[PDB]
Amino acid sequence: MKFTVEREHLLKPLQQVSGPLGGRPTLPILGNLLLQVADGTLSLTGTDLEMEMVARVALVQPHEPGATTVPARKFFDICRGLPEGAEIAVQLEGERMLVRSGRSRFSLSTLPAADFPNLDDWQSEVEFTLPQATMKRLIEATQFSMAHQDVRYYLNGMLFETEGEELRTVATDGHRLAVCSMPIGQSLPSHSVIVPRKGVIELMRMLDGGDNPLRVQIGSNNIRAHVGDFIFTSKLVDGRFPDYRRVLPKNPDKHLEAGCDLLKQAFARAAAASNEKFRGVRLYVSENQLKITANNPEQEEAEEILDVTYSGAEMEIGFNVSYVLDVLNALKCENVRMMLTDSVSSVQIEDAASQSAAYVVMPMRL
Amino acid sequence: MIRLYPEQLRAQLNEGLRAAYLLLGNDPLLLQESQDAVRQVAAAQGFEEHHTFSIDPNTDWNAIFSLCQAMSLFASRQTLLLLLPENGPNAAINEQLLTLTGLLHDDLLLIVRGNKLSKAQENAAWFTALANRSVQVTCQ
C-alpha cells in the first residue's frame, strides 16, 4: 500500500481513531491503527474491543491498495510534528512503514492487518436517519443521569428505544432519571438497547451539529453511527434496563411552576448556606409559595421564600441540590414545572413549554 | 452487641440480618468470606445497590453521608461496605463514623471492615452508638 496526503487532511482523523484510548496496551496490537487503502479511500481504524472508530479519507493524489497496522501514537506524533501544509507520502516496505515529507523520513514497525481484532460485519435489526442536532439533543438532555461504575452495570449506560416515528433515550442511576423523545419522521419498529457509558460519550463527542445528517444502525450486540467520514461502533450492555414508565409519579396532584433561573439562584444560595452539603435542601410548598431551606437539624435556620405558582395541598420534602440543579441546568429555559405527590415519592421536573424532556428525581430522607 | 466468629456467620446472618456488621481482624480469607456472606444474604432481601469506600484522608464523605440520605426510584436497598485503614480508624474517622452512625436507617446495611479494633480505642463515639444494634464478626 501507498498514499500521499496533505498533512491537514490526515490530522483530524488520525486524532479521532486513536482517540480516547491510551491507557495501556492490554495487548500490543491494540496500540495500533489499521490502515487500509483500496478504491480511492484510506480507512483508519482504532479499537479497544468495546468500541471502534473508523475514519475514511479520500485519496486524491495517486495511491496504491494494501493494508497494515502501525503504532497509533507514534504515527500521529510524526504527522503532528511536521510543518503545516506539508504533504505526507506514506509507503509500506517490508514489515516497516515509511512516512516521508520533504526531507524528513521515518519508518515505523508494523503488525499484520489480519491480526487486527477488527469486527467482522454484523446485521442491523433496525436503522434510520436523524439530524446530528437531534441526536445531540437526546444525549445532552439525559446523559448526566447515567450511572457511573454502579454495581448494576445495566445502569452505567444510556437506553435507546424506538416506537412510532420516535427515538428516545433514558438514563438513570437509581436516584434521578432523565428521558427525552424526538420525532424522526420514520416508521420504526419498536426496539430497545443499552449503549455503554463510554459509547455514549464518544457518540456525543463526534457530533459537530453540522449539515451531515447522522445515520444509525442497531444490530443485536452492537450499534453503529455514520457521521460523515467517521463510523462509530460500540457493544451494547447485556442486561435489562428498568422500566422508566413505572417510576414516573402517577396522576400527580401537586403542581408548582417557577422561574427556572430563579429556582436555580435560590438553590445556589441554599447550597452556599449549608455547612453540611450532604444534608441537602428542604422545600415547603403552600398555595402559590415555596419556602426553600438548606437543612441542618441542630441549628436554627434562615429560609428563603419564593413567589411561585402552586396550589392544592401544602407539603414539605427534602432534595439533593445536585440532582435538582442538574435538571435546571439541563432544562435551559424561562419557566419550570414540577409535579409532586409525597415527601417520600418521586417528583417530575419539566420545561413549562415543551415536553420532549422529562426528569424524575427521588426526594431525600430529610 | 453480638460477637460471633467467621465460622458461625452463615447461621446468625441467616436468621438475623443487622443494620451494621463489624468484620474486624487481619485475616485475608475470613474477612472476605464474612462480607461475601453478608453481601450474599443481603442481595437476598432487596439489596441490588452496593457500594464500598477505601477510608483514608481523601474519601469524599458527603457521597457516603448523602448516600445514606438518598431514596431509590426502584426501592433497591443498599449495602454500604467500608474498607477501614489497616491501622484502625484515624484521628477523626471517629467523628464521621459517628456522624454515619446517625445517618443509619433500615434500608442501609452498614458493613465496616479492617483488622482488630484499635486496642482500647474502641471507645470512639460511633462504635458506642452501633454497639447495641449490630454484630461483630471475629475474622481475626
Chains A and B form CB pairs within 8 A to the count of 57
Instruction: Assign A319 to helix, strand or coil.
Output: strand
A300 Cβ neighbours under 8 A, 6+ residues apart: none
Resolution attained, angstroms:
2.5
CATH code, domain with B11: 3.40.50.300
Tell me which amino acid residue A194 is.
Answer: I
Rg (CA), chain B: 14
Cβ–Cβ under 8 Å, residues A159 and A241: yes
Residue A355 annotated as lining a ligand binding site: no
Contact assessment for residue A359 and residue A331, using Cβ atoms and an 8 Å cutoff: yes
Spell out which residues of chain B touch residue A362, defining contact as CB-CB under 8 Å: 70-73
H/E stretch holding A308: none
Q: CA geometry: angle at A67 spanning A66 and A70, to 5°?
A: 140
Which residues, other chains included, contact A363 with Cβ-Cβ below 8 Å and sequence gap of 6+? A317, A318, A319, A342, A343, A344, A345, A346, A347, B71
Q: Which of A121, A80, A130, A129 is nearest to A101 (CA)?
A: A80
Q: Go through chain A and tell me how many residues it has.
A: 366
C-beta separation of A249 from A341 below 8 A: yes
The contacts of residue A70 (CB under 8 Å, 6+ apart) are A32, A33, A35, A97, A108, A109, A110
Q: Which DSSP string corresponds to A118-184? A: PPP----SEEEEE-HHHHHHHHHTTGGGS-SS-SSGGGSEEEEEEEEEEEEEEEE-SSEEEEEEEEE
CB A223 within 8 A of CB A182: no
CA distance B101 to B110: 9
Return the CA Rg of chain A: 26
Three cell numbers, residue A202: 464518544
Say if residue A73 carries a ligand binding annotation: yes
The closest alpha carbon to A101, from A12, A218, A4, A14, belongs to A4
The boundaries of the domain holding residue B30 are: 1-140
For A242, the 3-state DSSP assignment is coil
Q: How far is B30 from chain A (nearest CA, A)?
A: 23
Torsion angle defined by CA atoms of residues B73, B74, B79 and B85, in that order, rounded to the nearest 10 degrees? -40
Spatial separation of the C-alpha atoms in residues A62 and A40, rounded to whole Å? 9
Q: Would you say A149 is a known binding-site residue?
A: yes
Joined together, the cell numbers standing for residue A132 give 446530528
Residue B128 in contact with partner chain A when CB distance is under 8 A? no
For residues B124 and B98, is the Cβ–Cβ distance under 8 A? yes
**Is the separation of the CB atoms in B97 and B70 below 8 Å?**
no
- Indicate if the alpha-carbon torsion angle A67, A73, A76, A81 is positive or negative: negative
Q: At what angle do helices B93-103 and B61-69 cross, to 10 degrees?
A: 10
Amino acid at A343: S
Q: What was the elucidation method?
A: X-ray
By the 10 Å C-beta count (0-12 exposed, 13-18 middle, 19+ buried), B63 is classed as: exposed
Best mutation target among B61, B62, B66, B107 (most A Cβ atoms within 10 Å) is B66
Provide the grid cell at A320: 439533593
Alpha helices in A148-285 (DSSP H): 197-205, 260-273
SS3 A245: helix
Check CB contact under 8 Å for A151 and B74: no
User: Residue type at A98?
Assistant: L
- Is residue B20 within 8 Å of residue B112, measured between CB atoms? yes
Distance CA A266, CA A283 (A): 11
Measured distance CA(A327)–CA(A322) in Å, rounded: 8
Question: What is the spatial distance between Cα A150 and Cα A172, in angstroms, rounded to a whole number?
Answer: 11
Closest alpha carbon to A74 in A110, A101, A115, A104: A110
Q: Residue written as cell 446485521?
A: A123
Q: Does B50 lie at the interface with A, CB-CB under 8 angstroms?
A: yes
Q: Distance (Å, rounded) from C-alpha A195 to C-alpha A139?
A: 11
Chain B residues touching residue A175 (CB < 8 angstroms):
70-73
Backbone angles phi, psi at A192, to 5 degrees: -155, 135
Contact A362 B72 (CB under 8 A): yes
What residues 65-124 of chain B have any CB closer than 8 A to a CB of chain A?
Answer: 65-66, 68-74, 76, 105
In contact, A109 and A29? CB cutoff 8 Å = no
Integer Cα distance of B67 and A187 in angstroms = 43
Task: Say which of B48, B64, B70 has its CB closest to residue A152.
Answer: B48
Is A24 annotated as belonging to a binding site? yes
Distance CA A357, CA A182 (A): 9
- Which of B49, B64, B71 best tests the A interface by mutation, with the highest count of A CBs <10 A? B71
**DSSP track, B105-140:** -SSB-EEEE-SS--TTGGGSHHHHHHGGG-EEEE--
A285 by Cβ neighbours in 10 Å (0-12 / 13-18 / 19+) ranks as: buried
The tally of domains found in chain B comes to: 1
Determine contact, residues A99/A88, Cβ cutoff 8 Å.
Answer: yes
Inter-residue contact A219 to A124 (CB < 8 Å): yes
Let me know: does A201 contact A141? Beta carbons within 8 Å. no
Closest C-alpha to A159, from A237, A226, A232:
A237
Taking CA atoms, what residue in B is nearest to A323? B70
The grid coordinates of residue A215 equal 445515520
3-state secondary structure of A209: coil
Task: Please report, for residues A67, A72, B45, the alpha-carbon distance to residue A13 in angstroms, rounded to integers and kept in the order given.
Answer: 17, 11, 51
Question: Which of A270, A344, A335, A265 minimizes the C-alpha distance to A301?
Answer: A270
With CB atoms and an 8 Å threshold, state whether B71 touches A360.
no
Distance from CA of B17 to the nearest CA of A (A): 21
Q: Which helix (H) or strand (E) holds B42?
A: helix B28-44
Domains present along chain A, CATH in parentheses: 1-123 (3.10.150.10), 124-247 (3.10.150.10), 248-366 (3.10.150.10)
Describe the crossing of helices A321-330 and A260-273 by its angle, rounded to 10 degrees.
150
Q: Which of A145, A175, A240 to mutate to test the interface with B (most CBs of B within 10 A)?
A: A175
Cβ-based contacts of A152 with chain B (< 8 Å): 48-49, 76
Distance between CA atoms of A39 and A43, rounded to whole angstroms?
Answer: 10
User: Can you tell me whether residue A296 is helix, strand or coil?
Assistant: coil
Dihedral (CA of A275, A279, A281, A284) sign? negative
Nearest CB neighbour to A278, from listed B49, B69, B105: B69
The annotation status of A284 as a binding-site residue, yes or no, is no
Interchain CB distance below 8 Å, A320 and B70? yes
* Grid cell in block for residue B118: 484499635
CA-based end-to-end distance of chain A: 67
Determine which of A154, A241, A243, A278 to mutate to test the interface with B (most B C-beta atoms within 10 Å).
Answer: A278
What sections of chain A are H helices per DSSP? 7-17, 72-81, 132-140, 197-205, 260-273, 321-330
